[PDB]
Amino acid sequence: GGLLAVKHPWLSAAVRLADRDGYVLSGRLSTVEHAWVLDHVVLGTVILPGTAFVELALAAADAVGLPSVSELTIEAPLALPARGAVTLQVTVEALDATGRRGFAVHSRPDGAHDAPWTAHARGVLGAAPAAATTAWAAGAWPPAGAEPVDVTRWVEALDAWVGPAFRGVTAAWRVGRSIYADLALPEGVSERAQDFGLHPALLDAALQALLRAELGEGIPMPFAWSDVALEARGAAALRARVEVEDASDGDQLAASIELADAQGQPVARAGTFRARWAT
């Protein structure tokens, strides 16, 4: 024994270091078992979506007893092999005075114990506001004055090469600064949605909602996250409120995401997520 058990599709083991105040989490991401991940294709290459690093961080967070991610930045995409697996590792660092720990997410081609590790994401685990109220999701759906948004169109930025698991927006509307949306996964991927804290395809769908609103040149590309917390795990379809921040969206897009189930109760919140426009 001597290993802490983590209940997650992509993480299986955790050790507390005796050398340092820290933890090392380990796992495997097999393309054969999560085939849906292959639907996330970016310019010809299957890329692990950024929301998957959010889920990995959220899982490490609960494992070391610090729920929520304070900050998360993706500095390198993780390309996945069709028909294969990747080894993952989360390094968690010391506790600071704020009551938070830094962390990093690494990957290594599976079976290659010789191969070097690759850093993909860094951030801070810690105490964040866990949205206990989603006032907007209760009551009339969509909210009063909601103007429907065309999700059904094909935008190169979103639908090129992509398989059905990442076409997860049923409906969307905009009211002032807010985008509201119905998010749902396809019937096949919905199966294991209970197995994730928040299904990465489900959380990506909230980003598709905002991208199809702000493309209705350059593509806003998400790379960073703040104050992300999970209230209810295993959600398969939810209502979303995406509120864009006013601060001259043009060089860099920033928005808030909150998520609620069909019954109006809170599921998750991301205080802000950052995207930067680029070709």
Side-chain angles (χ1 to χ4, degrees):
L3 288 158
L4 196 169
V6 295
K7 60 61 172 188
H8 193 262
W10 300 342
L11 302 166
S12 37
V15 317
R16 176 167 227 169
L17 306 170
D19 200 344
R20 322 166 218 149
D21 185 12
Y23 300 82
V24 180
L25 295 90
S26 325
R28 196 171 135 265
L29 203 168
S30 97
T31 326
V32 290
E33 159 76 333
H34 316 287
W36 59 265
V37 173
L38 297 163
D39 300 16
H40 188 259
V41 185
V42 170
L43 321 193
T45 304
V46 179
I47 296 288
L48 189 75
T51 56
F53 290 111
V54 172
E55 161 73 5
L56 282 170
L58 281 170
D62 305 354
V64 310
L66 277 186
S68 147
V69 192
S70 268
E71 320 253 10
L72 181 273
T73 301
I74 296 148
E75 74 179 31
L78 152 70
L80 280 160
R83 193 151 175 131
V86 78
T87 301
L88 306 152
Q89 170 180 148
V90 181
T91 67
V92 180
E93 309 160 15
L95 203 41
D96 62 0
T98 68
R100 295 174 321 168
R101 314 159 154 280
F103 75 94
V105 184
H106 311 70
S107 91
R108 199 189 49 174
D110 173 61
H113 177 35
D114 39 297
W117 293 90
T118 298
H120 297 293
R122 330 182 100 106
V124 164
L125 320 171
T133 71
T134 51
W136 47 275
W141 187 249
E147 251 186 351
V149 170
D150 196 358
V151 287
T152 321
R153 141 171 143 149
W154 183 97
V155 46
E156 170 166 23
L158 287 160
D159 317 285
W161 286 284
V162 160
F166 292 87
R167 274 274 292 192
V169 179
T170 312
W173 314 254
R174 76 177 98 205
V175 186
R177 263 175 227 189
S178 295
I179 306 288
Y180 299 79
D182 275 328
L183 310 186
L185 300 169
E187 75 317 340
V189 48
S190 276
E191 270 214 66
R192 62 268 225 187
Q194 49 200 311
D195 301 320
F196 301 97
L198 181 55
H199 200 291
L202 211 45
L203 171 70
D204 203 81
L207 303 198
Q208 310 158 28
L210 163 66
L211 300 185
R212 300 186 196 273
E214 292 293 296
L215 304 180
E217 306 198 21
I219 302 132
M221 271 182 242
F223 70 104
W225 302 76
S226 295
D227 308 319
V228 174
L230 251 183
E231 210 63 47
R233 289 145 176 86
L238 38 63
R239 321 167 143 190
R241 177 187 192 197
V242 185
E243 156 174 1
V244 192
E245 167 40 48
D246 196 63
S248 190
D249 172 39
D251 43 328
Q252 179 154 149
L253 189 178
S256 187
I257 307 173
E258 318 179 356
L259 304 166
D261 65 350
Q263 318 311 136
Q265 302 299 304
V267 159
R269 158 177 202 274
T272 69
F273 92 94
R274 256 108 185 185
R276 166 179 239 274
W277 294 79
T279 44

